[PDB]
Design a protein around this nucleic acid. Sequence first.
DNA 1: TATATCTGACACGTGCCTGGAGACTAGGGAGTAATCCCCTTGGCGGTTAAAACGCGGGGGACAGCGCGTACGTGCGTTTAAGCGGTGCTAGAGCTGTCTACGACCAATTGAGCGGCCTCGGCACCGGGATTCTCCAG
DNA 2: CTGGAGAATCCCGGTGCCGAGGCCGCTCAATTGGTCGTAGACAGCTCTAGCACCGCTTAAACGCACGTACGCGCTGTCCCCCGCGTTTTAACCGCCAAGGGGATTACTCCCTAGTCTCCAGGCACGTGTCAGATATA
Lengths: 98, 95, 100, 104, 91, 89, 80, 81
Amino acid sequence: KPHRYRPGTVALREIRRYQKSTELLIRKLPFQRLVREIAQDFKTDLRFQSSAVMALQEASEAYLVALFEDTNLCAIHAKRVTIMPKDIQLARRIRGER
Amino acid sequence: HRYRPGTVALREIRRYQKSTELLIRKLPFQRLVREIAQDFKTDLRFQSSAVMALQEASEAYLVALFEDTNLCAIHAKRVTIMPKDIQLARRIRGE
Amino acid sequence: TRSSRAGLQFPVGRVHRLLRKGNYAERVGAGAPVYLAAVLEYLTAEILELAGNAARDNKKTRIIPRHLQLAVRNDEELNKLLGRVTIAQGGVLPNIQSVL
Amino acid sequence: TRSSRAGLQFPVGRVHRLLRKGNYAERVGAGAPVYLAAVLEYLTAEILELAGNAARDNKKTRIIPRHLQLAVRNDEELNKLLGRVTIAQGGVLPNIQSVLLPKK
Amino acid sequence: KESYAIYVYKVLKQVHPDTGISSKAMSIMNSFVNDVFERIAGEASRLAHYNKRSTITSREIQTAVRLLLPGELAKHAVSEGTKAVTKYTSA
Amino acid sequence: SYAIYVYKVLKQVHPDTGISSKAMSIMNSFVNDVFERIAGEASRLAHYNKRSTITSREIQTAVRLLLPGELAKHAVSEGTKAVTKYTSA
Amino acid sequence: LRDNIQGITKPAIRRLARRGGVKRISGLIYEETRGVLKVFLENVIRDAVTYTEHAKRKTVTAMDVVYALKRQGRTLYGFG
Amino acid sequence: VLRDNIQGITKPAIRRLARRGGVKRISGLIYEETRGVLKVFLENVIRDAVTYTEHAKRKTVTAMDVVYALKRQGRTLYGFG
DNA sequence: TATATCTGACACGTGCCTGGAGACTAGGGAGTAATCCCCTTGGCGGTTAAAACGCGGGGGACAGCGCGTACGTGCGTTTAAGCGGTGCTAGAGCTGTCTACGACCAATTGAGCGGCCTCGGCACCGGGATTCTCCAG
DNA sequence: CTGGAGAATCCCGGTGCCGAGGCCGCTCAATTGGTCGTAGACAGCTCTAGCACCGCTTAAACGCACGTACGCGCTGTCCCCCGCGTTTTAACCGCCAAGGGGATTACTCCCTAGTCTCCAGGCACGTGTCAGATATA
């Protein structure tokens, strides 16, 4: 028989897992290349402290996570568990970003 | 006719959003300020302009709360504000 | 006035003195206040321009805080730079909600 | 150290000169570093005590930023004083909404 | 008592000569100048401090302006300030 | 930094307890944070009364302005006690 | 003084909502708003009186409330 | 010239951060738009940060630069001195 | 509305003084050169974790629709808030002391910093019991 | 209505290590001991705005009946995001290799505070006036 988990057990279990851990999530070097790519528009062939870029990744994801908390609350009130783009627009709007 | 629901509301919104004069009764506001102020010192001495500035900041803060609350409602496919919605807004505001 | 010597209006001497004795550091460079008053006077020029347009377009001859209010709320940059500001006696702009 | 003369632990001298070398005011009253350093030592003791307790609550003897995470975020007063502050490698407080959990 | 009324009125006569001003609007504008004053002075102080400089020059002000104003308004501010400072110190 | 002082406090509060370097750095950043908060707000507080000296009066009032309730109260207790003890010497 | 939080009546609150652009208001909104406004103002009176008592003054000046609002990141203009 | 390295931050990585962020279900359109939101946020910070670097006329961005930038927007980060 | 009379808030005028401009000295912040190196960049190369892709498919977003309560609004009722007016006085602000305190310089010296141990908390690991879950009952 | 297998997790235990905590020279910054000039503590006093009460005016609050329009639940649809298997590379790390600009030391300077004087710009302060209110014919 196909060993299959129900929609949510592994997902929430993974949520709990990363709620226990404290390390950075996404891939590092492609992200650093994105950093240099965006950085091209100001000066070409820039030197970067790797740890500063790591700090950028940490603070950026902390920001993203906080946004996920707020849009998550928006989903909670709107009878959803699914985040939508307009919810992000609401959250950033209330924050004052547009 | 009986002045249909929404027309008088929208025109009233336009009129008072079109104007700028103060809208809260002065003596209840001032006495309320002094009454709450009693919890540190009773019978404060106040500048009138201070009371007016508190009325200004207060009403701007409340109106802004109605703006964010209303946008949360409209986003939430509603047009009727609820206290829990205000609590949600202030939580989103960080209060 | 040194403002007129630079072709400006805001007081170079007063701003220069208050900035030097603004308690940030004992010494302040000479061109910094001129640059400062120039930028603020420029800012003054666009906001007086928008306000003048507002009173003129609203059939008014004396500028009041209301014209400052919709002046700011109609200018994206003024809203951005003054995002933490509460305007006394200004009211709000009647931004009309879609459902309303 | 003047702290030891007062029976304290934070360096009144370094902070005090940082007040002169920090461009905040023209002159500094004598009681200011003593009073201020006292406030930092007390609040510091609060932070270390909560971090120590939290470390013991996790079968660990060494305090890591995760302990700063649950200790600070489980303290209302630090959460309110630091509502715009997120520290490096702190992570997230575990909290799953009831409507998200399955209904066993 | 110091105020900025007279200069704002002269600039008003420079932009819209046929427009007047209420006293309350002049006062609130003076408060606005006080705000801009505090923001720029504080940020410029921070900028000079971060690299431990004890003199506020035109470069620190320029960089500070570039930090506070997003884009074209900063471009016009730097343009006008640069023209003003250059033109003044060159005459 | 502040490592040696935080470790002294660690010996006073939890002697059988260690701390990571990263957390010590967090503590150093917090010390600098609180320092600029009190120094700036106290500085403008002194400016308000057009005073050029920040004394115990200004620091005390500034602490009650900046610190929330129970922590401020105990800060006044420990602080005032401490200033009394060192000042009487 | 007693019960002056109800002196800022519900019609005045409606005036705010019209100035805020609101069409329908729950009946429980008014008291919750009085609570939020209450705590908010308590914050204003607290630090404001701290400034007044600090200067050994008996009268609260306008500049003090300006400083208080500025501390809370909501700058208020209108005083030269 | 490198292009579209923001697509290097992939869909499951977004699912990683979002799942640590408390998100349980994710719309398919969330991913690219969220990459855009992140890009916007970074540009709000990285431009000002590199502007701090450019004031010093240096070619190496220091950690202090990102400290001052994050502090400037009230998004204080601890852990660097 | 003509005409004629009547007001008030702001434009325009005055007198007085005090804050800024000149020019100089003096000391020191900043640009500049040279120079070492260490971390930064960029490549090779192996291993494999992980993204992409795709195939179900149950379930969550969403619509329709129908029910019902409650909040707005007109209209009539009721009133204390607001203005003016009178009168008082605490205390903001002023005026006049007068100095002990905080900055400063120089001299002192031990705390605090940088480099260097070295060992055990914790990461990593492997292995068995328990717990929790999905899918059977 | 609930237990059975087995993946996940807890736990027990064993291994290694490198980061953490403790040691060891080595300065220089914190402390003292004065000194100097002044910010500010101090006492008494004005006046004036805040307070406080009287009295008239009416704007504003309150209550009720009514309807609708708004929330919300039921019920129904369906497709899209979860789950899992599969392939693929390109992420990861260790290593190799070059070298720039950051950090340091020192040079050289030119730029701003401080003194002192001087005076017209700038502050306070009435005066005209025109935007606009009022009466009668």
